[PDB]
């Protein structure tokens, strides 16, 4: 008795409703992407859409629209081809919301009439509310079904045998008969969670393929009534009502568990209210369990020496891409030696466990107050972490550090799982290819299990199988931000958090273990993730574009990857819209004001009340100390909260009008506090010949009176465990670190302090001074106040009471009040008015700190890649890496545009092309100065790099016009940074123009080999010279710290590696009158037939760039005399 | 959690009389046992005793 | 270590284990033995192990079904099992006798500190720090019942 689809075969689609205002406004940026971009294409699509202005209505209008033209699709098609419909998801992190708006839908299809008519009969109301599934939690899920669907699921399945399962039923049926009291309620709940897990698990254990149940008529049905995630599967419904925490750990279907986020290709999400979902999700990627980087490293080394996989057409191509792994899994290990187990040595530190914190990028912090270095004793056969000497000098330690070995040993564990990741889709590809014969066509979804069991099982890696289920759906969009590589687009949001607890395992008293907890995307990199797979997103939210990182989405972001897919409303849109809200909502047909008193900290009127309640008391620190229970501390806090809200809950009952009043306070008051309440209530008794204490964070009369005190705590917290709040709180630093409200040293302090246990207080008072405080104030008090009010009609005063500390904030406010409710724009205006207040604008600071953090980012990332280009062997691709920075800077050293890929190489500049700073580049990165605040420091431009008087050579030009290289400094306000600009720069440009002058006289020259790269620009030949020619080429003479020792060192390696080798020292750009000087090993005047270095002060002139013939000519003899 | 479950044996306690929350119970008891144990042996390892007395 | 080696040699472990053949992937192979005279098995015809180097895996295969006949000189699955349920039984005894000897050191080196634990003390400790360190901690559970039940012989002898 199903319902067909050939009940739609003389439906009318071309007919669509009248649509309002917020349709068009939804259907003409798609239409527009559409257009713009492809049609297989996501994009997010932010809409302020406010309280009772049809939010809901839209939203399913929408989904009933994209059903419908589904219909019409499928219709058309029918013979064509069978294709499993789009896929459409209503997600919002309350349980009710996802509820009500199902249920709204259903009554849609009921009630949406065209023409005055019925638009569908009966028999498309049948079929279209069949296509809609609700699939809640598991326990809410298992207490939905009757006893009929439970028994018929369990005979069918053969589970009667088991006596377990038919325990733990009669167990479940016995404590839903009495769900009477909550107390049996609670434990229903929990019994009724764990019999749905046991009977999913064996129930997908038995229906894998083996004895299939085949499941037809009532069976099918009860089955669907049990798992509504077997009526998508099958193709029954297309449309899910769920909430973010399902949408990200997923359903469960009769064959396995489905994610949306792996198959996301046309899939339409509507995400209510937007913002708050960045919690939502933070709360769950910040639930994961913590790996024994010690364990995980032993095991995978012990475990690929020898395991191997299969050679058979299904493996092909998947042992190739765990090579690079393997090979550095070993050298990882000989470098370590993993053969002996860690231990912790000395005081100090067998009392304090020892914690690290480390962004990937620059940002580390340890908990130690010395550096911890690991040494391998071979004799006591162990490794052992320790600090050593606290002095200076006096034979200094050459071991090791704890913190490469951990960020080594992270990376390792992600190549894994990433590698893990890419092999599953090669043996999805594999299989679809061998199996093309049989008409599956099964998706990566089918065989994403069946792959993982049996890598792992060929590898002996069964021990990691919940680690890659748990690092493959709210990170494996990856697959679908780039690496922390100086070519990517480098970011927190796809980077992460790692931290990490050495301390003694259980039991044992001398190993260790080394707990790593990591966060490897942030929520907008999971939203960017989304739309880059294919997900169109619609959230709704009034403030879904809020200018915080913490409470909302960082947009900066968004907006620097997505591109044209994060699709923005026009002006004309956003006053179409406003119109539409002042049509909807008017208060000037009622004559309804909106009253905003501003309260003040009035000591003395909480005083005189206080005197008023007990007359009789001499003074009121007496009941302050004992009655109340104040200390000295929050004496000050006590009355300024006591001293506001009296005069507002005063007020209100003044009111002749108002009849509730919801006043918004952080915490939920007190009993002491509530003796002033009932004094209160005494007062009111005569002063009027219904009022509620809200609180910013919870989850019939109409709304009519507000209090706003000063938004309180507004860092996210975690109460799941303790490392979910250590990974929330260094990710709200780290967010802002990123967007530019807080310097490098503030965020670097602020993270040393929190790894070592600070209170919530000083957190707070760490984020009170960045913009982003005062903008999640805003939000929040855009929140409260548009909740306050849902009835059409609504009385001539409304008041609404702010705290006094909000009047900077709410007078500081700067953005158009286009889609503004009438209450935050009437606070807006009330504030304006007072006086006069010095507005700096956040740019200026957020401009200096992110050049800041540029620069650190540059200093350390370019020591970390010379450093690791100074061993054997030198890896490819960080040569790759140093020569695209190299030529990136050459070409483009000013961009116009905000750069991509080579993100980290520029600052926005206030003056475009040139720039004023102040700093050591060897030293501390925070504490770099830039632009007006140095006005006499360091100069970047173009007349420092002597470019004008460098371009000048006839043989510059020629070369520079070859390559591309640019000839002048575009003035556009992206420039290059400090550390870049002078040793990057300065390094190519000195070596090329070296290159050019003696390519005048043919002169050949081949890049550095093996691993001594990094220590000349080139070698030579030239005229069929037999000994090797280095050439170390410099802007201007350079002596740095390692001096005399770093250039006899290097010879002695150059020697020591490949014999005899001339070398030559060249300055570009100087005065060419200083003539020849030749140098022994240490760079001291020597007999010119005995030296080994030649030194040439300038090969072009400084003055007119006349190229140094002479110079070229004595250098050539000087190689052809023997 | 711990103070979650405690408070759900308490309650269940409190209305111990068909044999359906009878089973239930002891099935709850015994798990809440397991955790508890485990949490007090793990607390007891060495680090921070809790002296046990009177 | 000499005789885990052996093992990883002769039956090639650096390949996994598969069934080839029909009749063998409808019904589970079954075997029994009494680890001196009695041995069982559910296969018509006696199960051969056979290491392929091309395909790099194991196989267990049941070739000809003749009596006789220039028998197979592959291996047999009978052998495998024998051998590594010796040796996981090895593994365990030789952990007993470990945590044995790590109760008597500790005594002898904390003999100035009063507390003389007994081995119900030093059992735990023991277990957790030898496989720790040979990086064995899922093998735990086995060791906790491994050592009562038949682990009274160190408060029958062996099978020769």
């Given at each position: 008795?199903?319902?067909?689809?050939?009940?739609?075969?003389?439906?009318?689609?071309?007919?669509?409703?009248?649509?309002?205002?917020?349709?068009?406004?939804?259907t003409?940026?798609?239409?527009?992407?559409?257009?713009?971009?492809?049609?297989?294409?996501?994009?997010?699509?932010?809409?302020?859409?406010?309280?009772?202005?049809?939010?809901?209505?839209?939203?399913?209008?929408?989904?009933?629209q994209?059903?419908?033209?589904?219909?019409?699709?499928?219709?058309?098609?029918?013979?064509t081809?069978?294709?499993?419909?789009?896929?459409?998801?209503?997600?919002t992190?309350?349980?009710?919301?996802?509820?009500?708006?199902?249920?709204?839908?259903?009554?849609?299809?009921?009630?949406?009439?065209?023409?005055?008519?019925?638009?569908?009969?009966?028999?498309?109301?049948?079929?279209?509310?069949?296509?809609?599934?609700?699939?809640?939690?598991?326990?809410?899920?298992?207490?939905?079904?009757?006893?009929?669907?439970?028994?018929?699921?369990?005979?069918?399945?053969?589970?009667?045998?088991?006596?377990?399962?038919q325990?733990?039923?009669?167990?479940?049926?016995?404590?839903?008969?009495?769900?009477?009291?909550?107390?049996?309620?609670?434990?229903?709940?929990?019994?009724?969670?764990?019999?749905?897990?046991?009977?999913?698990?064996?129930?997908?254990?038995?229906?894998?393929?083996?004895?299939?149940?085949?499941?037809?008529?009532?069976?099918?049905?009860?089955?669907?009534?049990?798992?509504?995630?077997?009526?998508?599967?099958?193709?029954?419904?297309?449309?899910?009502?769920?909430?973010?925490?399902?949408?990200?750990?997923?359903?469960?279907?009769?064959?396995?568990?489905?994610?949306?986020?792996?198959?996301?290709?046309?899939?339409?999400?509507?995400?209510?209210?937007?913002?708050?979902?960045?919690?939502?999700?933070?709360?769950?990627?910040?639930?994961?369990?913590?790996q024994?980087?010690?364990?995980?490293?032993?095991?995978?080394?012990?475990?690929?020496?020898?395991?191997?996989?299969?050679?058979?057409?299904?493996?092909?191509?998947?042992?190739?891409?765990?090579?690079?792994?393997?090979?550095?899994?070993?050298?990882?290990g000989?470098?370590?030696?993993?053969?002996?187990?860690?231990?912790?040595?000395?005081?100090?530190?067998?009392?304090?466990?020892?914690?690290l914190?480390?962004?990937?990028?620059?940002?580390?912090?340890?908990?130690?107050?010395?550096?911890?270095?690991?040494?391998?004793?071979?004799?006591?056969?162990?490794?052992?972490?320790?600090?050593?000497?606290?002095?200076?000098?006096?034979?200094?330690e050459?071991?090791?550090?704890?913190?490469?070995?951990?960020?080594?040993?992270?990376?390792?564990?992600?190549?894994?799982?990433?590698?893990?990741?890419?092999?599953?889709?090669?043996?999805?590809?594999?299989?679809?290819?061998?199996?093309?014969?049989?008409?599956?066509?099964?998706?990566?979804?089918?065989?994403?299990?069946?792959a993982?069991?049996?890598?792992?099982?060929?590898?002996?890696?069964?021990?990691?199988?919940?680690?890659?289920?748990?690092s493959?759906?709210?990170?494996?969009?990856?697959?679908?931000?780039?690496?922390?590589?100086?070519?990517?687009?480098?970011?927190?949001?796809?980077?992460?958090?790692?931290?990490?607890?050495?301390?003694?395992?259980?039991?044992?008293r001398?190993?260790?273990?080394?707990?790593?907890?990591?966060?490897?995307?942030?929520?907008?990199?999971?939203?960017?993730?989304?739309?880059?797979?294919?997900?169109?997103?619609?959230?709704?939210?009034?403030?879904?574009?809020?200018?915080?990182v913490?409470?909302?989405?960082?947009?900066?972001?968004?907006?620097?990857?997505?591109?044209?897919?994060?699709?923005?409303?026009?002006?004309?849109?956003?006053?179409?819209?406003?119109?539409?809200?002042?049509?909807?909502?008017?208060?000037?047909?009622?004559?309804?004001?909106?009253?905003?008193?501003?309260?003040?900290?009035?000591?003395?009127?909480?005083?005189?009340?206080?005197?008023?309640?007990?007359?009789?008391?001499?003074?009121?620190?007496?009941?302050?100390?004992?009655?109340?229970?104040?200390?000295?501390?929050?004496?000050?806090?006590?009355?300024?909260?006591?001293?506001?809200?009296?005069?507002?809950?005063?007020?209100?009952?003044?009111?002749?009008?108002?009849?509730?009043?919801?006043?918004?306070?952080?915490?939920?008051?007190?009993?002491?506090?509530?003796?002033?309440?009932?004094?209160?209530?005494f007062?009111?008794?005569?002063?009027?010949?219904?009022?509620?204490?809200?609180?910013?964070?919870?989850?019939?009369?109409?709304?009519?009176?507000?209090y706003?005190?000063?938004?309180?705590?507004l860092?996210?917290?975690?109460?799941?465990?303790?490392?979910?709040?250590?990974?929330?709180?260094?990710?709200?630093?780290?967010?802002?670190?990123?967007?530019?409200?807080?310097?490098?040293?503030?965020?670097?302090?602020?993270?040393?302090?929190q790894?070592?246990?600070?209170?919530?207080?000083?957190?707070?008072?760490?984020?009170?001074?960045?913009?982003?405080?005062?903008?999640?104030?805003?939000?929040?008090?855009?929140?409260?106040?548009?909740?306050?009010?849902?009835?059409?009609?609504?009385?001539?005063?409304?008041?609404?009471?702010?705290?006094?500390?909000?009047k900077?904030?709410?007078?500081?406010?700067?953005?158009?009040?286009?889609?503004?409710?009438?209450?935050?724009?009437?606070?807006?205006?009330?504030?304006?008015?007072?006086?006069k207040?010095?507005?700096?604008?956040?740019?200026?600071?957020?401009?200096?700190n992110?050049?800041?953090?540029?620069?650190?980012?540059?200093?350390?990332?370019?020591?970390?890649?010379?450093?690791?280009?100074?061993?054997?062997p030198?890896?490819?691709?960080?040569?790759?890496?140093?020569?695209?920075?190299?030529?990136?800077?050459?070409?483009?050293?000013?961009?116009?545009?905000?750069?991509?890929?080579?993100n980290?190489?520029?600052?926005?500049?206030?003056?475009?092309?040139?720039?004023?700073?102040?700093?050591?580049?060897?030293?501390?990165?925070?504490?770099?100065?830039?632009?007006?605040?140095?006005?006499?420091?360091?100069?970047?431009?173009?007349?420092?790099?002597?470019?004008?008087?460098?371009?000048?050579?006839?043989?510059?030009?020629?070369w520079?016009?070859?390559?591309?290289?640019?000839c002048?400094?575009?003035?556009?306000?992206?420039?290059?940074?400090?550390?870049?600009?002078?040793?990057?720069?300065?390094?190519?440009?000195?070596?090329?123009?070296?290159?050019?002058?003696?390519?005048?006289?043919?002169?050949?020259?081949?890049?550095?080999?093996?691993?001594?790269?990094?220590?000349?620009?080139?070698?030579?030949?030239?005229?069929?010279?037999?000994?090797?020619?280095?050439?170390?080429?410099?802007?201007?003479?350079?002596?740095?710290?390692?001096?005399?020792?770093?250039?006899?060192?290097?010879?002695?390696?150059?020697?020591?590696?490949?014999?005899?080798?001339?070398?030559?020292?060249?300055?570009?750009?100087?005065?060419?009158?200083?003539?020849?000087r030749?140098?022994?090993?240490?760079?001291?005047?020597?007999?010119?037939?005995?030296?080994?270095?030649?030194?040439?002060?300038?090969?072009?002139?400084?003055?007119?760039?006349?190229?140094?013939?002479?110079?070229?000519?004595?250098?050539?003899?000087w190689?052809?005399?023997?």
């Open positions: 008795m199903n319902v067909s689809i050939e009940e739609f075969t003389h439906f009318d689609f071309q007919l669509v409703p009248e649509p309002s205002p917020l349709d068009l406004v939804i003409e940026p798609l239409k527009n992407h559409i257009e713009v971009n492809g049609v297989k294409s996501g994009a997010l699509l932010p809409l302020p859409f406010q309280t009772g202005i049809g939010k809901t209505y839209t939203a399913l209008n929408f989904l009933l994209q059903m419908l033209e589904q219909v019409r699709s499928e219709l058309k098609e029918e013979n081809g069978k294709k499993s419909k789009r896929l459409l998801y209503y997600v992190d309350s349980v009710d919301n996802v509820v009500s708006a199902k249920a709204d839908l259903l009554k849609l299809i009921e009630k949406q009439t065209v023409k005055g008519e019925p638009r569908f009969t009966l028999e498309q109301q049948e079929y279209l509310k069949a296509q809609i599934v609700h699939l809640p939690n598991q326990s809410e899920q298992l207490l939905q079904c009757s006893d009929a669907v439970l028994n018929d699921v369990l005979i069918g399945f053969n589970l009667n045998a088991e006596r377990d399962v325990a733990e039923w009669s167990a479940i049926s016995g404590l839903r008969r009495h769900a009477s009291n909550p107390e049996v309620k609670i434990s229903l709940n929990r019994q009724a969670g764990y019999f749905y897990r046991n009977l999913i698990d064996r129930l997908q254990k038995k229906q894998k393929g083996a004895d299939r149940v085949l499941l037809s008529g009532s069976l099918l049905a009860s089955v669907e009534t049990l798992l509504p995630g077997e009526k998508i599967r099958n193709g029954s419904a297309h449309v899910a009502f769920l909430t973010t925490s399902k949408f990200l750990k997923g359903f469960h279907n009769t064959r396995s568990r489905y994610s949306p986020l792996r198959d996301l290709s046309g899939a339409v999400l509507i995400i209510d209210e937007i913002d708050k979902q960045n919690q939502v999700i933070l709360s769950e990627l910040c639930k994961q369990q913590a024994d980087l010690i364990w995980a490293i032993r095991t995978l080394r012990a475990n690929f020496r020898d395991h191997q996989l299969e050679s058979s057409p299904r493996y092909d191509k998947i042992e190739d891409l765990f090579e690079p792994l393997r090979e550095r899994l070993e050298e990882f000989t470098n370590w030696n993993l053969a002996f187990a860690f231990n912790t040595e000395g005081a100090n530190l067998n009392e304090r466990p020892v914690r914190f480390s962004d990937r990028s620059f940002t580390h912090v340890s908990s130690a107050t010395h550096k911890l270095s690991l040494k391998s004793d071979f004799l006591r056969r162990k490794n052992l972490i320790f600090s050593d000497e606290k002095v200076e000098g006096s034979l200094i050459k071991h090791g550090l704890l913190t490469r070995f951990v960020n080594e040993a992270d990376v390792i564990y992600q190549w894994f799982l990433g590698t893990m990741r890419k092999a599953v889709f090669q043996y999805w590809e594999n299989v679809r290819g061998l199996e093309i014969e049989v008409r599956e066509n099964r998706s990566l979804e089918g065989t994403f299990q069946e993982v069991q049996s890598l792992l099982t060929h590898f002996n890696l069964q021990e990691f199988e919940s680690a890659v289920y748990e493959f759906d709210t990170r494996g969009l990856r697959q679908s931000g780039k690496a922390n590589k100086l070519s990517s687009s480098k970011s927190y949001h796809h980077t992460g958090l790692k931290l990490v607890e050495v301390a003694h395992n259980q039991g044992t001398d190993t260790v273990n080394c707990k790593a907890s990591f966060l490897n995307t942030s929520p907008s990199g999971v939203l960017a993730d989304m739309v880059d797979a294919g997900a169109v997103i619609l959230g709704i939210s009034a403030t879904a574009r809020a200018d915080t913490i409470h909302n989405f960082d947009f900066k972001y968004l907006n620097e990857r997505l591109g044209n897919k994060l699709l923005s409303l026009s002006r004309e849109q956003k006053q179409r819209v406003n119109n539409y809200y002042h049509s909807r909502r008017n208060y000037k047909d009622n004559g309804v004001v909106l009253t905003v008193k501003y309260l003040n900290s009035r000591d003395a009127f909480l005083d005189a009340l206080l005197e008023e309640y007990k007359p009789e008391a001499r003074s009121s620190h007496f009941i302050l100390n004992h009655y109340l229970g104040i200390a000295e501390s929050e004496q000050a806090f006590v009355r300024s909260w006591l001293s506001k809200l009296l005069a507002s809950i005063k007020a209100f009952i003044s009111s002749p009008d108002n009849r509730y009043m919801l006043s918004l306070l952080n915490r939920t008051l007190d009993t002491t506090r509530q003796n002033i309440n009932d004094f209160i209530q007062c009111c008794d005569k002063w009027a010949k219904v009022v509620v204490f809200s609180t910013y964070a919870s989850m019939r009369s109409d709304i009519d009176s507000i706003l005190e000063k938004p309180t705590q860092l996210l917290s975690d109460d799941y465990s303790h490392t979910a709040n250590q990974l929330c709180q260094f990710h709200q630093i780290l967010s802002l670190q990123e967007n530019g409200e807080l310097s490098p040293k503030s965020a670097e302090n602020w993270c040393r302090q790894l070592m246990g600070m209170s919530r207080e000083r957190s707070l008072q760490q984020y009170h001074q960045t913009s982003d405080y005062q903008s999640a104030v805003r939000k929040y008090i855009e929140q409260a106040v548009g909740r306050a009010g849902r009835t059409s009609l609504k009385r001539k005063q409304i008041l609404l009471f702010v705290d006094s500390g909000l900077e904030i709410l007078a500081e406010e700067s953005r158009d009040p286009s889609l503004f409710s009438h209450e935050y724009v009437a606070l807006v205006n009330k504030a304006k008015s007072a006086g207040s010095i507005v700096e604008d956040r740019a200026v600071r957020r401009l200096f992110l050049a800041q953090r540029n620069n650190k980012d540059g200093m350390l990332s370019i020591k970390a890649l010379v450093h690791r280009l100074h061993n054997q030198a890896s490819k691709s960080d040569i790759q890496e140093w020569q695209d920075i190299r030529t990136q800077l050459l070409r483009y050293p000013t961009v116009a545009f905000q750069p991509e890929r080579f980290r190489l520029y600052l926005q500049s206030m003056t475009k092309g040139y720039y004023r700073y102040q700093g050591n580049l060897d030293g501390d990165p925070n504490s770099f100065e830039f632009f007006d605040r140095v006005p006499y420091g360091d100069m970047v431009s173009e007349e420092d790099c002597s470019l004008a008087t460098l371009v000048q050579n006839q043989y510059v030009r020629p520079f016009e070859r390559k591309g290289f640019a002048s400094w575009q003035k556009e306000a992206n420039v290059m940074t400090p550390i870049m600009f002078t040793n990057i720069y300065k390094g190519a440009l000195g070596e090329q123009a070296v290159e050019a002058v003696l390519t005048a006289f043919d002169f050949t020259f081949e890049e550095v080999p093996n691993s001594i790269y990094e220590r000349f620009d080139n070698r030579v030949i030239f005229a069929g010279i037999e000994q090797p020619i280095w050439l170390d080429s410099k802007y201007w003479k350079h002596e740095g710290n390692e001096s005399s020792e770093g250039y006899s060192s290097k010879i002695a390696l150059v020697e020591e590696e490949f014999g005899p080798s001339k070398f030559i020292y060249v300055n570009a750009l100087g005065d060419t009158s200083k003539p020849i030749y140098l022994n090993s240490c760079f001291v005047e020597t007999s010119p037939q005995l030296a080994k270095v030649i030194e040439i002060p300038a090969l072009i002139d400084d003055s007119n760039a006349d190229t140094n013939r002479t110079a070229v000519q004595e250098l050539i003899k190689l052809h005399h023997s």
